[PDB]
Every structure is written in structure tokens, then in C-alpha cells.
Design a protein around this ligand. Structure first.
Ligand SMILES: CNCC[C@@H](Oc1ccc(C(F)(F)F)cc1)c1ccccc1
Ligand code: NA
Ligand code: NA
Length: 498
């Protein structure tokens, strides 16, 4: 079995997974709409009661299973719980990253595509007034995606967008086909420093922005000025808990797959706590200093509410390009911005397609070459539903990431800490650890964390409870689960023979 080469590489690869576009775009928006700086109170709390406990568990399960040649949840859940339902629930943690890859890599191609368009200068050049600056970029993005102009729910992506998507896929394969150490780790050692420099360079440049409508100080001011009256809202505490899940990448079965390449007695407690910290630092320091400020610096603090309500997607794909087109040398600023985003996602995409690669290698005994190409083949095919069927993306994202990861997360708790036994589990987390987990976390992991998850579930289960074309997507994603259930079946039939 393959292994991480260096402790640093492990943490960077982990951190490379956790730091995606969400750090720079989703996190700033959520904070501004939920009390600004006061949002740090439920966020930090959820980071201690939910994020940190759940991270150590997936790290534990991964390493536990990885010692026995199994990096995937179908196998691992059968080890923690010798049962048929365990292998079935384990399917989800092979299903979720595979559904996300069906659109994530695609969105990742956009950044690459835009970064190419920005570098060569193939960007709109307005013209005055905000709608007169945004619209040329609104139409610029829609032509790329192929956003439906008619009543038909049909996308028509440009030939360029598609070609970049092929390239993007090819880029992902190029890294993944070299393995864990010489591929993901070696790239994590390059991308993460590259990421940091690009972030810092923008943070510096954003702070130097000065328009008649305001400055970057006004942006950091609005974003961080605490509104404690919103802490009364349970929805904020739900958005916080949901965000920690989103930003740490919990419940995707990717931490489990990745930790399974950590050696049996190697530390997971401290190494994990570091990778988790790297992610959070990236968000609060770099992420909330680039997007929101530059948007407020240009449109004024008056539109700071309207900008935050415009969504995290408009901010990164319509707003921020529109602003760079108005700044000195901003064509290159656009290029850096998107080239920052590309690697942020490229370090995440490679990480989650490993789950399917690890499955074919461990359970179906495929070589690394085949396991990669067939995983690429699957992703590439399924992505066509996202590329062409309008709102297919959103539907996939709603199930896989909305409840898929939250449900599978709470499943991970009960299986490892309640079914497998808490004592046996606690030793599995702390074993080989440079530092030991605080004795108080035993109660957090056993009661507080599942309580938070179960009462995030109920809050999700009710209010979060569309055109007929969503069924096409439902049809497909259900079909995937059945397909994976079948491979698990074939996986256990191949083992009884040998
Ligand atoms: C690292 N923090 C999580 C953010 C990111 O996580 C993932 C991103 C991509 C993948 C995939 F590439 F599909 F494997 C798997 C997980 C994600 C989560 C939900 C939707 C889109 C992206
Ligand atoms: Na993150
Ligand atoms: Na990433």
C-alpha cells in the first residue's frame, strides 16, 4: 500500500483539500449575512464542538482501515461494524465525492478557462453605473456556461469551455496517475505555497484599492463589524455549523481515504489539527480580505448588503471580474484571481476522485493506471449532465452536499463511536499522536457532536424539505448509487473466491 512521504506533504495535501473556493467566496458571504464579526462566535464554537471532533474521527477511521488495506467507507464500515447494512451505508461515502466531481471539476474548468481568457486579454471592456459594468461580465459568464436564453432547460457551453474542461480533466489525471506521494503530495508541496503567494499578493493589492465610492478599509470594516443581535437567530447557528462542515470538507469520505495513506502508528491528532488550522487561517485572513473588501471598495459600503445578498457565485464570477476591468492592469489581476481559484479547486478535485481510485485499487484490485482512467471516464461522462442540463448541477449539489455529507457525517459518528465502541475508538484516535486529545473531547464526540448533527438534520429535514427536469438528475444520481452498490457486491464476491 502507498503512503505519504513527509509529514509536511501530508498536511499540505490535507490542507490542499480543505482550502477550495469556499474559503475565498462562500465564507466571506456567510459571515457578512450572519452578524459580520459576531458570526465568529457560533463559527468558532462549531469548530470546536463539531469540526475538530469529526476531523479526528475520519482521520482515525482512515488510518485504521488503511492499515488493513482498505481506504474506502464500504470496506471500512464493514470493519467497524461487521454487517450488510454497514457496507450499504458505506456506499454513500463513495457516492458523494463521485457526485460532486460530476460538477466540481467542471466549475474548476471555468476558473481555468477564465484565467486563460483574462491572461490573453479576451475579456469584456466596459463602458459610469454599476449595471453598466456588471452586465458585460454577466453576459460574458453566461456565454461561457451557455446559460439558457429560452424557456428550455438546456445549456450550450462554448467550444472553448468544453475544451478547457477536457484539459482540466487531463490535468487532474496527470497528477493522480503519479500516485499519492509523487502525485498528490508532490503537487500539494507546490500548489499550497503558490496559493499563499497569490493570496498575499491580492490581499496587498486589494488594500491599495481606492475609488470615489470607498476603500478596502470600508470593506474590512463592514465585514468584521459585529452584529450580536443576529446571534439570537438559530438560522445563524445553523449556517455556522453547516459552514464548518463545508469548509473542513467533512462527510465526503475524502479525509478517510486520505488518512488511510497515513502509516499505522503515525500521528493524526496534531497533523490533523494543523491542516484544519491552515484551512481556517486561509479563510479569515486571506479570504475575507480579498473578495468582500474589493467589492465594497468599488461599489461602496452602501451596496455592501446588496453585494453579499447577490450570492457567493456572482461575487467571484461577475462582480470581481467587473472590478478588475476598472483597475490599473486589472486584466492581469483577473488572471491571478482565477489562477488562485483554479489551484484551490485542483487541490480539492484530485483529493476526492481518489476515493473512487482507492476503491478500485483496494477492493476490485485494479492497477493505479486503470483505476484512474476508469474514474476519469466515469466523472467525464456524468459531467455531461451538468454541462448540458440546466440546474442539474444544483440538484446534484443539493443531495450530495446538502444532506449527503451531513447525514453521512452523523453515520460516521454512530458507527465509529457508538457501534464500534467509544473506548476502542478513542484509543484509535490518540494512538501514535504527538499530542493527546484533551480528555473533555470524549464527551463532545459521543454526545455534543452527534446532538449538533442530529439537530442540524432536523432543521435541514424540515424547511429544506422545481421543474420536472430535476428527475433526470435524480434518475442519474440514484443510478450511480445502484451502480456502486453493484461494484461493492462484485468486490465481496471476488474475495470469497480467493
Ligand atoms: C474542502 N471543503 C469542502 C469544499 C468542497 O469539498 C469537495 C470538493 C470537491 C470534491 C470532489 F472533487 F468532487 F471530489 C469533494 C469535496 C465542496 C463541498 C461542497 C460542494 C462543492 C465543493
Ligand atoms: Na475550506
Ligand atoms: Na483545494
Amino acid at each position: 500500500r502507498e503512503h505519504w512521504a513527509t509529514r509536511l506533504g501530508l498536511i499540505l495535501a490535507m490542507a490542499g483539500y480543505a482550502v477550495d473556493l469556499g474559503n475565498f467566496l462562500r465564507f466571506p458571504v456567510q459571515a457578512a449575512e450572519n452578524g459580520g464579526g459576531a458570526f465568529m462566535i457560533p463559527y468558532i464554537i462549531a469548530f470546536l464542538l463539531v469540526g475538530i471532533p469529526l476531523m479526528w474521527i475520519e482521520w482515525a477511521m482512515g488510518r485504521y482501515g488503511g492499515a488493513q488495506g482498505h481506504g474506502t467507507t464500504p470496506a471500512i464500515f464493514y470493519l467497524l461494524w461487521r454487517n450488510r447494512f454497514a457496507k450499504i451505508l458505506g456506499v454513500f461515502g463513495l457516492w458523494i465525492p463521485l457526485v460532486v466531481a460530476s460538477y466540481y471539476v467542471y466549475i474548476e474548468s471555468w476558473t481555468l478557462g477564465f484565467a486563460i481568457k483574462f491572461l490573453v486579454g479576451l475579456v469584456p471592456e466596459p463602458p459610469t453605473d454599476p449595471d453598466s459594468i456588471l452586465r458585460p461580465f454577466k453576459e460574458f459568464l453566461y456565454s461561457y456556461i451557455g446559460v439558457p436564453k429560452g424557456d428550455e432547460p438546456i445549456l450550450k457551453p462554448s467550444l472553448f469551455a468544453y475544451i478547457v474542461f477536457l484539459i482540466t480533466m487531463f490535468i487532474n489525471v496527470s497528477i493522480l496517475i503519479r500516485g499519492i506521494s509523487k502525485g498528490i503530495e508532490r503537487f500539494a508541496k507546490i500548489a499550497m505555497p503558490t496559493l499563499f503567494i497569490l493570496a498575499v499578493f491580492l490581499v496587498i493589492r486589494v488594500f491599495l484599492l481606492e475609488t470615489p465610492n470607498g476603500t478596502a478599509a470600508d470593506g474590512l470594516n463592514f465585514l468584521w463589524t459585529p452584529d450580536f443581535e443576529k446571534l439570537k437567530d438559530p438560522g445563524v447557528w445553523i449556517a455556522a455549523v453547516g459552514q464548518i462542515f463545508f469548509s473542513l470538507g467533512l462527510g465526503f469520505g475524502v479525509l478517510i481515504t486520505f488518512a488511510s495513506y497515513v502509516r499505522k502508528d503515525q500521528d493524526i491528532v496534531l497533523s490533523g489539527l494543523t491542516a484544519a488550522t491552515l484551512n481556517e487561517k486561509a479563510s479569515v485572513i486571506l479570504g475575507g480580505s480579498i473578495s468582500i473588501p474589493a467589492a465594497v471598495a468599488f461599489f461602496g459600503v452602501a451596496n455592501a448588503v446588496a453585494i453579499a445578498k447577490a450570492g457567493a457565485f456572482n461575487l467571484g464570477f461577475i462582480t470581481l471580474p467587473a472590478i478588475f476591468s476598472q483597475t490599473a492592469g486589472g486584466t492581469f489581476l483577473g488572471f491571478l484571481w482565477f489562477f488562485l481559484l483554479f489551484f484551490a479547486g485542483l487541490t480539492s478535485s484530485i483529493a476526492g476522485m481518489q476515493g473512487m481510485i482507492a476503491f478500485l485499487e483496494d477492493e476490485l484490485k485494479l492497477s493505479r493506471k486503470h483505476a484512474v482512467l476508469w474514474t476519469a471516464a466515469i466523472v467525464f461522462f456524468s459531467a455531461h449532465l451538468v454541462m448540458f442540463l440546466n440546474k442539474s448541477l444544483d440538484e446534484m449539489d443539493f443531495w450530495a452536499t446538502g444532506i449527503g455529507v451531513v447525514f453521512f457525517g452523523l453515520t460516521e459518528l454512530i458507527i465509529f463511536f457508538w457501534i464500534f465502541g467509544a473506548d476502542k475508538a478513542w484509543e484509535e484516535i490518540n494512538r501514535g499522536g504527538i499530542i493527546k486529545v484533551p480528555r473533555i473531547y470524549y464527551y463532545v464526540m459521543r454526545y455534543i457532536t452527534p446532538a449538533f448533527l442530529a439537530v442540524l438534520l432536523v432543521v435541514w429535514a424540515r424547511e429544506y424539505i422545481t421543474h420536472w427536469t430535476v428527475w433526470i438528475t435524480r434518475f442519474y444520481i440514484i443510478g450511480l448509487f445502484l451502480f456502486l452498490t453493484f461494484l461493492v457486491f462484485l468486490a465481496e464476491r471476488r474475495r470469497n473466491h480467493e
